[PDB]
Design a protein around this ligand. Structure first.
Ligand SMILES: *[C@@H]1O[C@H](CO)[C@@H](O[C@@H]2O[C@H](CO)[C@@H](O)[C@H](O)[C@H]2NC(C)=O)[C@H](O)[C@H]1NC(C)=O
Length: 199
């Protein structure tokens, strides 16, 4: 059976993907790539005929998609709108058709976040709130302590998708350096550190 893999499965905006088809039958009459599944005429990206080397761009072409005779499709300069599933439909020497599906997700890279704190000097048993300042909607926020992952406890409280970390009551051992790290499957950035002095 044929199998495709996205190269890469997760893709930055403006980068490329190869839809890499393994085990394309050798005796294909033609194949064609369609946006989404199941196969529809509107969705046709490209149609390639084996014997004649003839390409015809469908309604879904956007001037970025290149087909190779080995079945694989290169999409260059991707957008988040290109996310989703794609199908190759293959007609054999007779006129029998087979399908194969593949998907890939494309993300915008995360922007550089900042770390503000309510107060650097604070008294044991006070509260303190750290805020990860990012414009990035729907990004993954993780917290760090002296360059390693923060072990969360009963004393802590994450709000607004982890951008607000409040610690209460603070303790002798919370003294250290804090960063927030912001990520998606394609990119990651760390904030400035905030040093914290306890008394
Ligand atoms: C099918 O065709 C494509 C393009 O001819 C091949 O992809 C290239 O091969 C290697 C492996 O990914 C890379 O060094 C090239 O840069 C690739 N081209 C790209 C990403 O456009 C692919 O290997 C071929 N082979 C198959 C399907 O077995």
């Amino acid at each position: 059976e044929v199998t495709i893999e996205a190269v890469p499965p997760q893709v930055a905006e403006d980068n490329n993907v190869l839809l890499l088809v393994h085990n394309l039958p050798l005796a294909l009459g033609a194949f064609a790539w369609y946006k989404g599944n199941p196969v529809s005429t509107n969705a046709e990206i490209v149609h390639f005929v084996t014997g004649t080397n003839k390409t015809t761009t469908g309604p879904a072409h956007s001037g970025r998609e290149t087909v190779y005779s080995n079945g694989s499709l290169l999409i260059q300069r991707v957008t988040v709108k290109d996310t989703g599933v794609y199908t190759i439909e293959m007609t054999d020497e007779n006129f029998r058709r087979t399908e194969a599906t593949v998907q890939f997700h494309v993300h915008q890279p995360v922007t550089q976040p900042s770390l503000q704190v309510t107060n650097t000097t604070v008294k044991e048993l006070d509260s303190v709130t750290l805020t990860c300042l990012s414009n990035d909607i729907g990004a993954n926020i993780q917290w760090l302590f002296n360059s390693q992952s923060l072990q969360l406890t009963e004393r802590m409280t994450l709000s607004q998708n982890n951008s607000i970390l409040r610690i209460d009551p603070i303790k002798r051992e919370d003294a250290g350096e804090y960063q927030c790290e912001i990520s998606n499957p394609v990119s990651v950035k760390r904030s400035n550190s905030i040093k914290l002095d306890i008394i």
